[PDB]
Amino acid sequence: RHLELNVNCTKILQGDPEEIQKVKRPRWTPHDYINMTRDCASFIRTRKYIVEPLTKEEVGFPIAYSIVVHHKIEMLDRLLRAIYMPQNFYCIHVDRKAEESFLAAVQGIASCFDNVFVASQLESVVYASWTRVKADLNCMKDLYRMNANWKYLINLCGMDFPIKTNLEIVRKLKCSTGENNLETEKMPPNKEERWKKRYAVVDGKLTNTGIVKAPPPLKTPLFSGSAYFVVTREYVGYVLENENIQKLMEWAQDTYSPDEFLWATIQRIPEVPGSFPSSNKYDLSDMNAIARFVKWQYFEGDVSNGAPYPPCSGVHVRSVCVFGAGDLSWMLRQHHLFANKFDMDVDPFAIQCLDEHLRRKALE
Amino acid sequence: RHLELNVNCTKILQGDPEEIQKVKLEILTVQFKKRPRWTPHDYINMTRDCASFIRTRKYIVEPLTKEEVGFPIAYSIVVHHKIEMLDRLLRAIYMPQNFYCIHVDRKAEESFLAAVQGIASCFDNVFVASQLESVVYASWTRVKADLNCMKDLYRMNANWKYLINLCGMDFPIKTNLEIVRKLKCSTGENNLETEKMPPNKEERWKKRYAVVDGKLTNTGIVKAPPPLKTPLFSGSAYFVVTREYVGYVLENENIQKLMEWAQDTYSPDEFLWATIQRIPEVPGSFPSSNKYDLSDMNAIARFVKWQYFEGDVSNGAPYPPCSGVHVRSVCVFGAGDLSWMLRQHHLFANKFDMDVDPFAIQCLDEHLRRKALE
Ligand SMILES: *[C@@H]1O[C@H](CO)[C@@H](O)[C@H](O)[C@H]1NC(C)=O
Ligand SMILES: *[C@@H]1O[C@H](CO)[C@@H](O)[C@H](O)[C@H]1NC(C)=O
């Protein structure tokens, strides 16, 4: 139990109403990590990172990660540790607007592992802009050329957390049998202004300029989706090299939230590795895809009455549920690989319980 | 191996335009269409000596892997004719650890039934259902045929994991091991088409139907609303369900109420399973929210090509044109349909017919056998 990580978690994980209510300040700073990481051997030991593969099955199925962050070093460290394995690869994209101490702290952690690094290209990410997509593309470039054996790439943000162990992830990926898995649905006509008009970053905010854009440079229709995906290395190589895709991406640079349509659209282009035909019969909702479990305030409700999922037990930020300990029990029963979003400032117990649970389960 | 099975199937499976064209011209040959075919009486005799039947037909009577042994599958096969296709189908999916219930329509020729009973007598885990229905197209009796097999299979063994129902025109496109793996990947959930009920399919349960002149017809009588809190969903007669789902369907009172209500609807097989799959508390079900809907293409139960959807895949069509022939808008596969088909994730495909293209079945059959023996 030396690798295991005053509330009873088991009761929380079982959805015990008693503890849920019962549950519903010291903290390391970037400088603590900068110092703490000087001695990698001790950092790794004290933080309890797993530096040896757990099974031969996992050794044979390497996974790559693109992690886009900009703050909260303790959360990054906790997320990294939860998903870290020696055989995998981890690219960390630190926003150019991040505090220098944060960047130094991230490099501090990354510098302790030969498979963790900071992307060779970094963007100043603006909410809803192409730069958010570019951040992942920067990591895709690095990850693709550095190793030819990883099977899938999963992109993450700082407030994500896994709800599956590395082994469980590997198994679900094998279950996809070479196909990609991400939300991709017929584009609602009502969102057309997101790409029919040109957007410009005005005073820090991406805004509609009213300038008319040309039609998308592709035969295939645009599809609606998420910024999060689970794609094969082959999909990545195609995105990075295919000329038509490059044309599509350059056209998308001045659209609104291109991250919410680019991946979903490419996933339906013929000849793209791991893609699905454009016929709507193949559409995948956020719940049917396994990329990310996210609760939207306007959809929460009585599951036995038509609701996709139960109400949030934490708090809502921009209509998105920031999980509370009470959300954990139902959440763990879903098939998604990761869930969003978590925040130590909202409910640190939702994190701790999940983290401890996955570590114990993995050590089995 | 004694178990392996002038056309080069390897090229067909690769979509070789040349090899495909060759099989199509072969089919047209008078010599081919005038080839000797087996009769139900041939099978009645051949099955007299089971040891000989098994060896001659090359049935696998020993598990291939420990993985498969630890994951038994049950099958409900609804048939009424074409004994050779039933033979090819059964052989292609047969494994000693699995269970197979065959429902022969009560209106099937007496010789067909005898033949089926003959084939079944050769395998302890293969049997004819204890209750046989006279199935009328689109009627509740089609559903009853499967319910009859569910009862027999559920009581016969408590260790099988999933039940997969089939008809005589189906054929697998996955080996038993591949099937076992996709079922394990389902993590105790069922898998079948289930989507929001289309407005153009409501007249089927809003009115009572009765068989008139051999066909189910609207009586004009309006029936009460379904005995359910959740909505009715649209789907297919074919499913992939856990043993737990089967036990719940056979036992639960409310489900019982739903079924009795559906008895006089049109094509209840196309909404019953899809609907039960969305009822809270049903083992392996999905929430009723439409975010969980599964189309025929996203579900893994059955790959079927509908004439009105076929087209340029690279332009919006869910699949390429039928290389075989269409019957009631459904594509009866030709050898040319195999290449693309094998790349799909479904467990089985429909429809196949050795009177349309025997090579479609043969190439698929050899490929799966070879793949399994590897
Ligand atoms: C069928 O053709 C393939 C190459 O297209 C070849 O590998 C295979 O051996 C051929 N089969 C026979 C029996 O000639
Ligand atoms: C075997 O089947 C043939 C028809 O194929 C039938 O005429 C014959 O009687 C059977 N053999 C016997 C005599 O048992």
Give dist(CA B102, CA B115) in Å, integer: 12
Contact B364/B338 with Cβ under 8 angstroms?
yes
Q: How many helices (H) and strands (E) does chain A have?
A: 15, 14
**Burial profile B26-51: b = 16 or more Cβ within 10 angstroms, e = fewer:** bbeeeeeeeeeeeebeebbebbeeee
Give dist(CA A132, CA A126) in Å, integer: 7
B233 touches chain A (CB under 8 A): no
Cis check: omega of the bond before A196, within 30 degrees of 0: no
How many whole angstroms from B45 Cα to the centroid of ligand 2? Answer: 6
Which residue in this structure is represented by tokens 């309890």?
A48
Going A240 to A246 to A250 to A253, the CA torsion angle's sign is negative
Contact A323/A313 with Cβ under 8 angstroms?
yes
A335 touches chain B (CB under 8 A): yes
A317 touches chain B (CB under 8 A): no
Number of domains in chain B: 1
End-to-end CA separation in angstroms for chain B: 11
By DSSP bridging, strand A63-69 and strand A152-157 are parallel
**Residues found in chain A:** 364
Give dist(CA A62, CA A89) in Å, integer: 8
Give dist(CA A338, CA A290) in Å, integer: 8
Give dist(CA A164, CA A161) in Å, integer: 9
End-to-end CA separation in angstroms for chain A: 10
Output the DSSP codes for A250-317: HHHTTSSSGGGTHHHHHTTSTTSTT---SSGGG-B-TTTSSSEEE-BTTT-S-GGGT-SSPPPSSEEE
Amino acid letter for position A83: I
Range of the domain at B171: 1-374
Give dist(CA B140, CA A67) in Å, integer: 54
DSSP H/E element including A90: strand A89-94
Which residue's CA is the nearest one to ligand 1's atom 11? B8
Query: Residue B316: is it exposed, middle or buried by C-beta count within 10 angstroms (0-12/13-18/19+)?
Result: middle
Output the DSSP codes for A22-35: HH------HHHHHH
Give dist(CA A147, CA A139) in Å, integer: 13
Nearest Cα to Cα of residue A322 among A299, A302, A339:
A339
Nearest Cα to Cα of residue A184 among A249, A266, A255:
A266
- In the DSSP assignment, the letter for residue A333 is T
Helix axes A233-241, A130-146, angle to 10 degrees: 110
Amino acid letter for position B61: V
Nearest Cα to Cα of residue A289 among B37, B291, B283:
B291
Resolution (A): 2.0
The residues lining ligand 1, judged by C-beta closer than 6 Å to any ligand atom, are B 8, 10-11
Cis check: omega of the bond before A72, within 30 degrees of 0: no
Phi, psi of B123 (to 5 degrees): -140, 120
How many whole angstroms from B50 Cα to the centroid of ligand 2? Answer: 16
Dihedral angle computed from the Cα positions of residues A137, A143, A146 and A148, in that order, rounded to the nearest 10 degrees: -110
Give dist(CA A265, CA A292) in Å, integer: 18
Cα angle: A289, vertex A293, A297; to 5 degrees: 120
Amino acid letter for position A62: P
By DSSP bridging, strand A63-69 and strand A197-202 are unpaired
- Determine how many CB atoms are found less than 10 A away from the CB of residue B159: 11
Task: Tell me the shortest Cα–Cα distance from A147 to chain B, in angstroms.
Answer: 28
By DSSP bridging, strand A161-162 and strand A338-340 are antiparallel
> Please, which experimental method was used?
X-ray
Q: From start to end of B170-226, where are the E strands?
A: 171-172, 195-196, 207-212, 215-222
Query: Residue B312: is it exposed, middle or buried by C-beta count within 10 angstroms (0-12/13-18/19+)?
Result: exposed
Q: CA A4 from chain center: how many Å?
A: 24
